[PDB]
């Protein structure tokens, strides 16, 4: 059952996004099913999937707080933050592009949770 890994990728992985502007956030949040209700904040990791998986090994991760792992490498990310407002569509988002390491939870060698708290700021 790698369904939590597949859901992680749906909520938090976009290999090569192109523009990482407000329109990108509004479109991908709809595409990935995150607008019923409107998720308040959601981050997408970009780049190679093998790098994200490697976070669950000593190859690209350290243990972090109680039960998480933090990556040794930096990743291109885009944080989508709801503007307002309403919990139901239409959902308007502000994009913030960044480049830093990420905090995940691992199960059976695979990422299954992204810790959003480092992208609140
Ligand atoms: Pt979900
Ligand atoms: Pt706003
Ligand atoms: Pt406003």
Instruction: Give the whole-angstrom CA distance, residue 100 versus residue 3.
Output: 26
- State the catalytic residues: 12, 113
> 43 CA distance to ligand 1 centroid (A)?
13
Question: How many domains are there within the chain?
Answer: 1
CATH code: domain of residue 37: 3.10.130.10
Q: Give the range of the structural domain holding residue 77, as residue numbers without chain letter.
A: 1-121
Q: Tell me the two tokens of residue 46.
A: 């970009």
Question: Does the CA dihedral 109-70-63-10 come out positive or negative?
Answer: negative
User: Residue positions in the annotated binding site?
Assistant: 20-21, 80, 102
Nearest to 96 by CA among 53, 54, 59, 43: 43
> 58 CA distance to ligand 1 centroid (A)?
28
In degrees and rounded to multiples of 5, residue 9 shows phi and psi of -65, -45
DSSP string, 51-97: HHHGGGSTTTEEEETTTEEEESS-EEEEEEEE-SS-SSSSPPEEEEE
User: Residue positions in the annotated binding site for tRNA?
Assistant: 20-21, 80, 102
Instruction: Give the whole-angstrom CA distance, residue 68 versus residue 58.
Output: 13
Q: What is the resolution of this structure in A?
A: 1.9
Q: Which numbered ligand comes closest to the C-alpha of 92?
A: 2
> 34 CA distance to ligand 1 centroid (A)?
7
């Amino acid at each position: 059952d790698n369904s939590r890994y597949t859901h992680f990728l749906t909520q938090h992985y976009d290999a090569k996004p192109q523009g990482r502007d407000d329109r990108y956030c509004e479109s991908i949040m709809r595409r990935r099913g995150l607008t019923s209700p409107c998720k308040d904040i959601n981050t997408f990791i970009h780049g190679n999937k093998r790098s994200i998986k490697a976070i669950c090994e000593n190859k690209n991760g350290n243990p972090h707080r109680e039960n998480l792992r933090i990556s040794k490498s930096s990743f291109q990310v885009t944080t989508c933050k709801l503007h307002g407002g309403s919990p139901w569509p239409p959902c308007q988002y502000r994009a913030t592009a960044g480049f830093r390491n990420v905090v995940v939870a691992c199960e059976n060698g695979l990422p299954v949770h992204l810790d959003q708290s480092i992208f609140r700021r």
